Design a protein around this ligand. Sequence first.
Ligand SMILES: [Mg+2]
Ligand SMILES: [Zn+2]
Ligand SMILES: [Zn+2]
Ligand SMILES: [Zn+2]
Lengths: 48, 78, 181, 48, 66, 59, 115, 29, 466, 44, 258, 59, 432
Amino acid sequence: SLKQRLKGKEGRVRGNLMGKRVDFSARTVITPDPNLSIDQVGVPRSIA
Amino acid sequence: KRITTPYMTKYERARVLGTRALQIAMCAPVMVELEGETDPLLIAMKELKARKIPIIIRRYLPDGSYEDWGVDELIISD
Amino acid sequence: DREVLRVIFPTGDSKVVLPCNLLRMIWNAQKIFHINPRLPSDLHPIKVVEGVKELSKKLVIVNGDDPLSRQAQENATLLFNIHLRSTLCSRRMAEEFRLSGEAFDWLLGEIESKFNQAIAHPGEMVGALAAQSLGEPATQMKNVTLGVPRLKELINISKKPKTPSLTVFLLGQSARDAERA
Amino acid sequence: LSEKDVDPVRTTSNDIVEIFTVLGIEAVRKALERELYHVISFDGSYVN
Amino acid sequence: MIIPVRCFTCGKIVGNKWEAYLGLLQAEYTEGDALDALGLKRYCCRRMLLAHVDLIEKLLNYAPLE
Amino acid sequence: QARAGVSQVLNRLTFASTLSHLRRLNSPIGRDGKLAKPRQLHNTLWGMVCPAETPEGHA
Amino acid sequence: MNAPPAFESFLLFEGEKKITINKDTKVPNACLFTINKEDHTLGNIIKSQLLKDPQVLFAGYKVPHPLEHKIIIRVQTTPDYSPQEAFTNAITDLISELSLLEERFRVAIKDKQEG
Amino acid sequence: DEITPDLWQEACWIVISSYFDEKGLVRQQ
Amino acid sequence: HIDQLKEREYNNYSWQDLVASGVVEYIDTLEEETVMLAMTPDDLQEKEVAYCSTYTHCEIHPSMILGVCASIIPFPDHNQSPRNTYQSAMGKQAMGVYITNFHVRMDTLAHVLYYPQKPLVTTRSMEYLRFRELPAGINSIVAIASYTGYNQEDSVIMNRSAVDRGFFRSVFYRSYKEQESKKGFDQEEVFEKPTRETCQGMRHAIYDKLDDDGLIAPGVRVSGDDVIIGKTVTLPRYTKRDCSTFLRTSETGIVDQVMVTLNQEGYKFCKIRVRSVRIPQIGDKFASRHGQKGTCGIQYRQEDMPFTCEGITPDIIINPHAIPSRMTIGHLIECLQGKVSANKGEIGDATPFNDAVNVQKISNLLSDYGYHLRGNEVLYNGFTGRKITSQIFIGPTYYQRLKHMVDDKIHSRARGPIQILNRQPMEGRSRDGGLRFGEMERDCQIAHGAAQFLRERLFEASDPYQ
Amino acid sequence: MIYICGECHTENEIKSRDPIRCRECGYRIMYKKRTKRLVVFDAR
Amino acid sequence: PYANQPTVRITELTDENVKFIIENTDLAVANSIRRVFIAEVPIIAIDWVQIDANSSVLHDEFIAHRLGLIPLTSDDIVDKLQYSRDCTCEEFCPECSVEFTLDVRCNEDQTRHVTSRDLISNSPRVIPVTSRQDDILIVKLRKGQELRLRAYAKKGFGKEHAKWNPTAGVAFEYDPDNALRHTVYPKPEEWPKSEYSELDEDESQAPYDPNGKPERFYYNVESCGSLRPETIVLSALSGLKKKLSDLQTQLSHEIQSD
Amino acid sequence: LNGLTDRDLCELNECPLDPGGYFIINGSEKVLIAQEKMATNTVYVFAKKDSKYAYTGEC
Amino acid sequence: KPSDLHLQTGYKVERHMCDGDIVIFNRQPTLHKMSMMGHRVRILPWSTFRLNLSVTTPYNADFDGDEMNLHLPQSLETRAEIQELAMVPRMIVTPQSNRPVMGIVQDTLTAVRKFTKRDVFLERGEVMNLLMFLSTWDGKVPQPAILKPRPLWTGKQIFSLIIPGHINCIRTHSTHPDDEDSGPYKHISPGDTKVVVENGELIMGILCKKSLGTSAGSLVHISYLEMGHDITRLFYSNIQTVINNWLLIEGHTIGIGDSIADSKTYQDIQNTIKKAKQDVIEVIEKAHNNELEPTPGNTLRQTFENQVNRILNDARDKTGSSAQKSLSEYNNFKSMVVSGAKGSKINISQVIAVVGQQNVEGKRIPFGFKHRTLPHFIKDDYGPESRGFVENSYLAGLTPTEFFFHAMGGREGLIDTAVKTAETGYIQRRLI
RNA sequence: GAGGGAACCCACU
Ligand SMILES: [Mg+2]
Ligand SMILES: [Zn+2]
Ligand SMILES: [Zn+2]
Ligand SMILES: [Zn+2]
């Protein structure tokens, strides 16, 4: 129903307005790097 | 007659730097002398350090009134 | 100020949370200005008194000159002004900290700048900050209940707590012997 | 609290609702702060 | 599945030793003596032959598609 | 209105996963339940149920 | 997927300089030698050979990132001496060392093989 | 004769090997 | 009974004869609550205070309380119990040889290690799990050391030279199924090699690698944007449109096998197995048999890894800090026992409750082979040749390559497919989807005060509309 | 084209829309030939 | 000129290993020599595989990897062989590569052990090492299984791939009695003595030498078979000298350019 | 595959180490996970909490 | 076509993300505002997100398979918002507990405990190699703490070069004696356990988690308060690089020899366990012969349980105290504990001496059978072995009953994590 | 130069 469309964490408001899928985002496994400064992240060339 | 803080807040600093950087990226005149650097953020921060950014911050009070502060009128303490 | 402190802190816990670390900046002034603690100082005690007075004048949390504004400003900086007068006492500054005149002027300027750097910025979403600051330690959490169930019993105002209890304190001799207790 | 030789000043409950109904809204504000502080600082954890 | 050509740690050739090791074990050698007869001194080369599972023999029991 | 997950696709990533999936028991108590007693390792599981092999998370 | 080719640890691509010298402005008579597509081998021998020169006041090397192939050798010398001259003399001494070691190894192999 | 404690480990793994030679591991299914 | 069972295939004496002899009997949980169990026969042969003189039953072996996955753990009674639980979880994710007839089978997901080894340190219960015949892992020279800082926070340094020699190399097999279907009289999907001027709505890809039956051939290299099954469906000049089966994106590989058959209802049915070789990589998950999971942080070559005086470099370097809070002492004992096992030429016994195996006995056995009795060795720095001041614990430990490679998880999106209903980005890397900027992220960006970034994420990086 | 029968190891010519059955033994599971295209492996 | 004057003492020279001692040099020189042993001594190994038929139970990349790990004799031919990156040919030529062919069909009821003896080279100076011990098992075939392939072997060193590493084990040691305290034993009596130790049985460790430096280095270079171990050491010294000479040339060009 | 030797299983392209214990449904291998339940025909007496019943017997 | 490759002023070029780009970096669950921080992009040649180690603490991240998210700001306003608001150096100190969230972690921590000890002396080449990794170094090699017989620098000199500006900080090492400050050697520490940094120079003391960690008043906290975010960022990076390169020389391990105690220590532990089991049997005999007096506010069974748990906790504490007292200065468990990097004294106690009592729901192991914990015990057995006291260590190995009871204990922690996540998340959502 | 949803299960941090 429309109420089931709107309600819940998967509904319209919580699942599509309070939070939503975004462009220009990447996700992968993290590995250590003691040679980077604390404000610096190593990024794979394919993601970039 | 202005009761708000004389210091530029961190949010004011962030938004003024971003807005001035976008204006410089849209070919606004540069208010300072630039030593051959390209990035609009760097030009915006050296304009802010020289306190020459031509932007007025309108701070809204909860009563609905507002105060207009020049960027050259605020203290950039951070 | 001591009487006001003992009203505020009746348990005698002197550990407080305050903006400017006065002892560390006195140590910083000693190291910067090469203060010899074994030599007499050139700092007049009246310079200490008047400098702390003007510094406390120019550490403003509540603006305004009306009596309501002055009372709110005095209340908002009461602990810090008490700690400032306690730390920058003329006796302590003369025989314990031994600061010079230029060291004391730099100390006043540093205290003023560090206090003005500590004031909350307008635009701070402090409610979300508070909700994340009380929920992040919750991830790491007489039969009195504590932890996450007690936090749930607190933020949900429960008419039926799991372990309701009193802490009854006794008056006079009733508190001193076990038989009348 | 009404009982004889019981301190009518320092005696308190851990029940938020009865502290509100007996002593008022500022007292239950202080009691709420004390109980939240107890829950937080049981572990030695500190929150500002 | 099949014996590796090299020891993983050092790169000593162990791919020519599996059948010799099996023949030594068939000749009533102990595993340590069979490893010592093949010149596998380092324990990194000895785990190559000691821990090898020769799955290719059981794979060869299936009729080939090709 | 019927129980789900009685029949599962057999895990074939390792022989150990195949054996473990072929010898798998399931309590049909909902994983949204926050009571600890069915999830606890009971004393009577000695020699019958492995005390180490359980999933992590809701199950 | 993001795997670099294995020859990139030792092959200079087109336009990549092998060694670049930069004057270190912090202290007098100091230079930074950025050597591309090398590793701890040459960096270690050159640093230890520069440490033997009494006119060298500082000698060190670093790999700034192990996933890159780059050596930074910082050399500081006395004012009457040059870090480029120190670096060249260190390479010359290492070359003479290896030439002498090569011929003595050949002599020792011949002696061991004859008996 | 009783199984001596020095032979017990070998004997118990013999009877376990016999159990898994007969039943296997998926006997319940 | 033991003598009769030693010749099980000669006497025809079996376990069932042992049950019929009145020697063993099956006790369930309700009856076990009335029996009196001796843990060992040492509880029977006990002196004047045996703690019980009325034992009714005896455990055959206590280590039989473990399951299939917990029986591969060496020294499980020297580990913390949650670590045994974590290893029982991860032994099902370890890549080895999952079945012998894997060449016949076309499973959707299949994983075959090149060189699976039986452990040097086994349990006796592993003789019946067939782990000696289908093992999942490699005995690895593991040094527990802090080297260059790249093994911190549950990470490992791998030997790149070892990896080049086939150390933990695996094969990923993926099967793709497709079938012609007669969904109506006019509709007719067919395996054909499509033509650009004839088929409607192609995906701008190449079709030359298809044979003229519409199916790609075995042995052909394929990439993420490649057609492997060419299926066209008749449209009721473009008489048919393209519904070809595509390879999953960024999953490069080689077509291993193509099988053509008939389904239940008699249409042509093709299954294509594509093979891709997975060399160990930074970010690939590796676990010992003690709950010591961790991704590869860096790979050093043999000349960069630390070495012993015999020239042995570790295959894997793990951080010391993985041990103390975990208390996986069975990992250390397995490493020590594996050093002893590889020097002696034997398979070490790590049955849980075994008094014949002790840390002191393993230490004396190791000292009998010219090594330090506690498994430490003097290691030399690979970069400089100088001795490391501390002496490094190093020896063979069984490691497992887990199914979680980084190349099956790396995902980026700039712009692409969106959902039909809410016009927001899709789900998962398989659909080129976006990541969810959830409610908690929204709260965090509220607390940051970054309102324009919040507007960018929640309005104009997701679904602008006017 | 040429498909190997799964059971009887023999090669069979199959045209399009022809049902996939081995003309020798009637086995319904058949496999494609290895390609003739030239594929290079680094020996790494 | 502050060069060392190192001396060589060969203590063992077999066909498999060389044990030798280098005196009067620095620790960095010794370690770099060891690193060039492992990483920067060029040999010839198979790097290009074209499989024509593979009916075996092992897939094509598996066979190619095993072929790459087979050592090939490289004595006196890897010096005159060119790198494929430095060669004027288009794809391959005898000046930069060696062609190998393998053609094995199993038609018997016995399992056919396709070994390195079945690798037939077009150059007689570059053959598998076990074809001059048993032969390195490439694959096992049953009846009806076949393997035809054509390979090309090219020059390379172990910095690129470990198949070009010529050494099995480079044992390296210095200061065997721990006089320099470069390692610190919590219990020195628990530690076995080195092979090169010069201590009595009652002593566990040398007295501390505050004026000492690492000056004597012990090597056991074990060869995988591609080169003789003395050829490995000589080629390593030559390669390190050539690296230093090329770096000196580029350094002189950089100095003159500024 | 019942009663077949390992050679007969290999001639049928089956793994002799494969345990069985599963079904093939539409070509997919399906295992039936065992399901726990309360035992039947047994009297179990519990104490229901926060209810009108002090004790309850169940069969 | 080249006609479509022409650029005019006012055009936009959607260029690839390159070095120096500002991104937001995130790990779920995003609990506080420092689980999403701004990072500068550096392109590295593998398929993972490389992360600095000190940054793993505000993310609650490790590298056992964690996946993290990276959001690219698309405009200059959002880029400047992230740059001036949400960068990692600006997020060093939290408003939650007015203390740093990121500190020195595990190997930098273990080796800065090992590096700032009094007997650490570095030669000229080692000092030059360490100064190669000091990015804030001014180029001047300091005068060594020892000039003759040989020029040797201490680790405190090199860390004084690392410490930025003129930080003045007084801390204590974790092994600082309680009576030392009242003794005659207060300002000259015999064990080097009073940390004094003066004018940015580490004058004395061994650094640890109490000095370089995420506590209030720590050295990185003073660096943030006095020098700002950029200098403190350089401080973190310099500590990590210099200490991680000295650890190549020094090295750190853990072995099976760190789990061994002395034979005298093993005898003491066995004697303590025997005495405590005898005490438990004596309390059992007192309760069985009705000679056990209940304490006020409790019934007889709960007073018996309190007495037994007091005896067994005293046993575990005394055996653990003997275990730590056996440990040498070379012990690596002790090194990682006194550095604050990983582990506790309880972990050392369980590895070396006694695992201890297994507890389910705060009590001993329940009688899941009829009055028996396991069918290997007699009925109404209230002794330590029966009810879940593990008298063995992890080195010694557990008995089968102890193994099963330890599994019962660890299942409780797994259940607690799994069922507390949902209620805690609901509490966070309602609070927000 | 990009055409399904839903349900369930397993797994990951
Ligand atoms: Mg993790
Ligand atoms: Zn080896
Ligand atoms: Zn046929
Ligand atoms: Zn050529």
